[PDB]
Design a protein around this motif. Structure first.
Motif, PDB file in Angstrom:
ATOM      1  N   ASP A  65       6.684   2.302  -0.904  1.00  0.00           N
ATOM      2  CA  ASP A  65       6.253   1.631   0.337  1.00  0.00           C
ATOM      3  C   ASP A  65       6.865   2.171   1.640  1.00  0.00           C
ATOM      4  OD1 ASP A  65       8.328  -1.115   1.037  1.00  0.00           O
ATOM      5  OD2 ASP A  65       8.613   0.220  -0.675  1.00  0.00           O
ATOM      6  N   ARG A  66       8.039   2.795   1.590  1.00  0.00           N
ATOM      7  CA  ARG A  66       8.560   3.430   2.807  1.00  0.00           C
ATOM      8  C   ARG A  66       7.903   4.779   3.086  1.00  0.00           C
ATOM      9  NH1 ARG A  66      12.977   1.190   5.507  1.00  0.00           N
ATOM     10  NH2 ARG A  66      12.517   2.791   7.103  1.00  0.00           N
ATOM     11  N   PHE A  67       7.391   5.416   2.038  1.00  0.00           N
ATOM     12  CA  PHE A  67       7.015   6.817   2.167  1.00  0.00           C
ATOM     13  C   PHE A  67       5.892   7.018   3.186  1.00  0.00           C
ATOM     14  CE2 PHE A  67       9.208   8.972  -1.755  1.00  0.00           C
ATOM     15  CZ  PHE A  67      10.417   8.482  -1.299  1.00  0.00           C
ATOM     16  N   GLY A  68       4.996   6.031   3.269  1.00  0.00           N
ATOM     17  CA  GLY A  68       3.958   6.037   4.290  1.00  0.00           C
ATOM     18  C   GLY A  68       4.537   6.212   5.684  1.00  0.00           C
ATOM     19  N   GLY A  69       5.482   5.340   6.036  1.00  0.00           N
ATOM     20  CA  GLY A  69       6.201   5.484   7.285  1.00  0.00           C
ATOM     21  C   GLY A  69       6.757   6.889   7.436  1.00  0.00           C
ATOM     22  N   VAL A  97       1.400   7.046  -3.920  1.00  0.00           N
ATOM     23  CA  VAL A  97       1.985   8.152  -3.137  1.00  0.00           C
ATOM     24  C   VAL A  97       1.015   8.909  -2.215  1.00  0.00           C
ATOM     25  CG1 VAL A  97       4.019   8.275  -4.595  1.00  0.00           C
ATOM     26  CG2 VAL A  97       2.080   9.801  -5.085  1.00  0.00           C
ATOM     27  N   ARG A  98      -0.190   8.370  -2.027  1.00  0.00           N
ATOM     28  CA  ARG A  98      -1.142   8.952  -1.060  1.00  0.00           C
ATOM     29  C   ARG A  98      -0.888   8.540   0.390  1.00  0.00           C
ATOM     30  NH1 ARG A  98      -4.613  10.235  -5.196  1.00  0.00           N
ATOM     31  NH2 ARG A  98      -4.890  12.508  -4.742  1.00  0.00           N
ATOM     32  N   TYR A  99      -0.919   9.522   1.272  1.00  0.00           N
ATOM     33  CA  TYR A  99      -1.029   9.217   2.681  1.00  0.00           C
ATOM     34  C   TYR A  99      -2.091  10.112   3.316  1.00  0.00           C
ATOM     35  CZ  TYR A  99      -0.130   8.930   7.644  1.00  0.00           C
ATOM     36  OH  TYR A  99      -0.281   8.813   9.012  1.00  0.00           O
ATOM     37  N   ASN A 100      -3.139   9.474   3.830  1.00  0.00           N
ATOM     38  CA  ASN A 100      -4.229  10.192   4.477  1.00  0.00           C
ATOM     39  C   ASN A 100      -4.805  11.264   3.582  1.00  0.00           C
ATOM     40  OD1 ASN A 100      -4.218   8.622   6.739  1.00  0.00           O
ATOM     41  ND2 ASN A 100      -3.449  10.228   8.149  1.00  0.00           N
ATOM     42  N   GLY A 101      -5.072  10.886   2.335  1.00  0.00           N
ATOM     43  CA  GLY A 101      -5.707  11.781   1.387  1.00  0.00           C
ATOM     44  C   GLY A 101      -4.776  12.809   0.758  1.00  0.00           C
ATOM     45  N   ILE A 333       2.546   1.416   4.235  1.00  0.00           N
ATOM     46  CA  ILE A 333       2.615   1.556   5.695  1.00  0.00           C
ATOM     47  C   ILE A 333       3.523   0.539   6.425  1.00  0.00           C
ATOM     48  CG2 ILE A 333       0.559   2.994   6.070  1.00  0.00           C
ATOM     49  CD1 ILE A 333       0.600  -0.864   6.145  1.00  0.00           C
ATOM     50  N   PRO A 334       4.017   0.910   7.612  1.00  0.00           N
ATOM     51  CA  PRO A 334       5.013   0.060   8.284  1.00  0.00           C
ATOM     52  C   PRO A 334       4.507  -1.326   8.748  1.00  0.00           C
ATOM     53  CG  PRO A 334       4.336   1.857   9.705  1.00  0.00           C
ATOM     54  CD  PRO A 334       3.748   2.150   8.360  1.00  0.00           C
ATOM     55  N   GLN A 335       3.203  -1.460   8.975  1.00  0.00           N
ATOM     56  CA  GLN A 335       2.592  -2.746   9.298  1.00  0.00           C
ATOM     57  C   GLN A 335       2.833  -3.835   8.250  1.00  0.00           C
ATOM     58  OE1 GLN A 335       0.967   0.198   9.478  1.00  0.00           O
ATOM     59  NE2 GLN A 335       0.550   0.486  11.678  1.00  0.00           N
ATOM     60  N   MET A 336       3.203  -3.444   7.030  1.00  0.00           N
ATOM     61  CA  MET A 336       3.613  -4.428   6.022  1.00  0.00           C
ATOM     62  C   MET A 336       4.657  -5.363   6.596  1.00  0.00           C
ATOM     63  SD  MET A 336       2.048  -4.490   3.376  1.00  0.00           S
ATOM     64  CE  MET A 336       3.069  -5.463   2.288  1.00  0.00           C
ATOM     65  N   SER A 337       5.450  -4.831   7.517  1.00  0.00           N
ATOM     66  CA  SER A 337       6.495  -5.622   8.158  1.00  0.00           C
ATOM     67  C   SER A 337       5.941  -6.900   8.814  1.00  0.00           C
ATOM     68  CB  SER A 337       7.247  -4.772   9.170  1.00  0.00           C
ATOM     69  OG  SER A 337       8.099  -5.589   9.915  1.00  0.00           O
ATOM     70  N   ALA A 338       4.833  -6.786   9.543  1.00  0.00           N
ATOM     71  CA  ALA A 338       4.211  -7.990  10.092  1.00  0.00           C
ATOM     72  C   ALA A 338       3.675  -8.849   8.952  1.00  0.00           C
ATOM     73  CB  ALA A 338       3.096  -7.650  11.085  1.00  0.00           C
ATOM     74  N   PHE A 339       3.003  -8.204   8.002  1.00  0.00           N
ATOM     75  CA  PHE A 339       2.450  -8.947   6.892  1.00  0.00           C
ATOM     76  C   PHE A 339       3.515  -9.854   6.253  1.00  0.00           C
ATOM     77  CE2 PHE A 339       2.287  -9.331   2.339  1.00  0.00           C
ATOM     78  CZ  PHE A 339       1.056  -9.902   2.100  1.00  0.00           C
TER      79      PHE A 339
END
Ligand SMILES: [Mg+2]
Length: 535
Positions: A65-69, A97-101, A333-339
């Protein structure tokens, strides 16, 4: 400061780093290349700090989950395993482990919550949430509890809440749509209502947390708990005779626990990427590598099929993998933080009764999605909301011609920035259904509009609409459950009739924008800087 010709690896202290060191040893033996394994404290905040200066480890291990960031911030190299290698690991783990394909790390292990039960109290654990209340009734008479688990963290309550169609952010091919959150639905309302009921009927306490549930289970006071593999060793100590199994269904739907994937990323600043790849692919991810690490400290379930097949002879590991498969990869992604926050609040407010289920869920459903973007996202959000409140749906629905127009929708807006950066173009997709009733159609078409920065008389500088017109190829008609007759007609009627009832609204909406957003956009268009993402 990163040395070429060796490998430095960071992994968390609660993992099997000594075993991993033994893997590094075999690696040095074969290649002569030295491998250093460190477990710095707060490595998850340390890596972005040092890596941003072009320093840090060659390989970082951490929950996916951090790797996206890390990817967005350019900290991670794309990894290049061949398909033969990819076949060796479960597909869903590659999705973590995907980010943007692109592949941004190597999956290693997988974990999820499971139902943990006391075999002496409850030899045959329930397959459904619904039968829990009755079970709690019996057990209280025997002076005990059916179920105790942490209600303070949405991580623990999510499996139930999300069981029917719930999700955090929608996944599309390595991309999360940050505007699409699944927290609010009939599933979520039912699940959270159920939890709250269990509290009202005194089958649970609202104030129950990790430590209380852990103690209560490990002391044999309650028959069941919900927890992960990290909890197992404390139960081993407790002498409680326990089992680990699939989470209970709610309304015949499987529980939907979040899935964490321990993963290994390669530092974008590393001079050693090829050695790192070699080490990870041929040394670490093998029955032997994983065995070394696992015997040091247990991995739980793993992403490597061959080794997972061995481990799953352990029914608790097998249960873990089963709950993972039925679960939701945690968005990377970092938006999980708001979630998290949105959801945490809601649950705590529901269980306290401070809010109703529906209101907590509705607030949360809004706030989870509310992270602010840069100019491009702000602009498209602002325009969509503008058009909607400007009553664009009504304008579509009330378009004249037996027929009934229905289901007007604004679709996702597109944005394009001139190569020189001085110019801006918006695509507005629009849709409606036609009832020839019998013979229902779905029409979709685009309006493209130019957005211009213009100084006028003189230092006054504004943001105005350029040519607002239908997109020529854009009109598409689709049968639902004649043409080219109808479409043949609509091609020469529709685009002009739509574009004329719309472009004015577009024009008003542009003016209704937040004034600082306008100034910043204008400011970037003038100096020809790109804030818009190529898609
Ligand atoms: Mg799979």
């Amino acid at each position: 400061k990163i040395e070429e010709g060796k490998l430095v690896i960071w992994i968390n202290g609660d993992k099997g780093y000594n075993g991993l060191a033994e893997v590094g040893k075999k690696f040095e033996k074969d290649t002569g290349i030295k491998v250093t394994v460190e477990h710095p404290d707060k490595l998850e905040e340390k890596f972005p700090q040092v890596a941003a200066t072009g320093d840090g480890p060659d390989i970082i291990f951490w929950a996916h989950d951090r790797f996206g960031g890390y990817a967005q911030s350019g900290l991670l190299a794309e990894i290049t395993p061949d398909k033969a290698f990819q076949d060796k690991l479960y597909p869903f783990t590659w999705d973590a482990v995907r980010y943007n394909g692109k592949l941004i790390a190597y999956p290693i292990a997988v974990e999820a919550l499971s139902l943990i039960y006391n075999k002496d109290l409850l030899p045959n654990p329930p397959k459904t949430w619904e039968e829990i209340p009755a079970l709690d009734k019996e057990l209280k008479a025997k002076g005990k509890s059916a179920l105790m688990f942490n209600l303070q963290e949405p991580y623990f309550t999510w499996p139930l809440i999300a069981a029917d169609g719930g999700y955090a952010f929608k996944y599309e091919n390595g991309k999360y749509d940050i505007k699409d959150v699944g927290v609010d639905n009939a599933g979520a309302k039912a699940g959270l209502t159920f939890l709250v009921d269990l509290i009202k009927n005194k089958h649970m306490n609202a104030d129950t947390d990790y430590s209380i549930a852990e103690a209560a289970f490990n002391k044999g006071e309650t028959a069941m708990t919900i927890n992960g593999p990290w909890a197992w060793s404390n139960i081993d100590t407790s002498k409680v005779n326990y089992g680990v199994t699939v989470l209970p269904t709610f309304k015949g739907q499987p529980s939907k626990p979040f899935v964490g994937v321990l993963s290994a990323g390669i530092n974008a600043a590393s001079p050693n990427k090829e050695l790192a790849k070699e080490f990870l692919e041929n040394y670490l991810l093998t029955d032997e590598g994983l065995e070394a690490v696992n015997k040091d400290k247990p991995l739980g379930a793993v992403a490597l099929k061959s080794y997972e097949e061995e481990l799953a002879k352990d029914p608790r590991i097998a249960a873990t993998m089963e709950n993972a498969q039925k679960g939701e990869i945690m968005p990377n992604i970092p938006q999980m933080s708001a979630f998290w926050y949105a959801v945490r609040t809601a649950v705590i407010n529901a269980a306290s009764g401070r809010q109703t289920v529906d209101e907590a869920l509705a607030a949360a459903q809004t706030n989870a999605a509310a992270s602010p973007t840069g100019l491009a996202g702000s602009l498209t959000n602002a325009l969509s909301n503008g058009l909607l409140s400007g009553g664009l749906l009504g304008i579509l629905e009330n378009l004249p011609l037996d027929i009934k127009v229905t289901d007007p929708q604004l679709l996702e807006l597109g944005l394009v920035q001139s190569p020189d950066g001085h110019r801006l173009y918006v695509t507005i997709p629009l849709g409606i259904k036609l009832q020839v009733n019998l013979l229902r159609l779905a029409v979709k078409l685009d309006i493209t509009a130019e957005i211009l920065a213009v100084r006028d008389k003189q230092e006054r500088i504004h943001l105005v609409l350029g040519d607002c017109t239908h997109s020529p190829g854009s009109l598409q008609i689709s049968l639902l459950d004649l043409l080219d007759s109808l479409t043949g007609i609509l091609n020469k009627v529709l685009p002009e009739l739509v574009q004329g009832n719309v472009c004015p609204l577009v024009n008003e909406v542009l003016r209704g924008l937040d004034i600082t957003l306008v100034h910043d956009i204008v400011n970037m268009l003038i100096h020809g800087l790109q804030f818009v993402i190529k898609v």
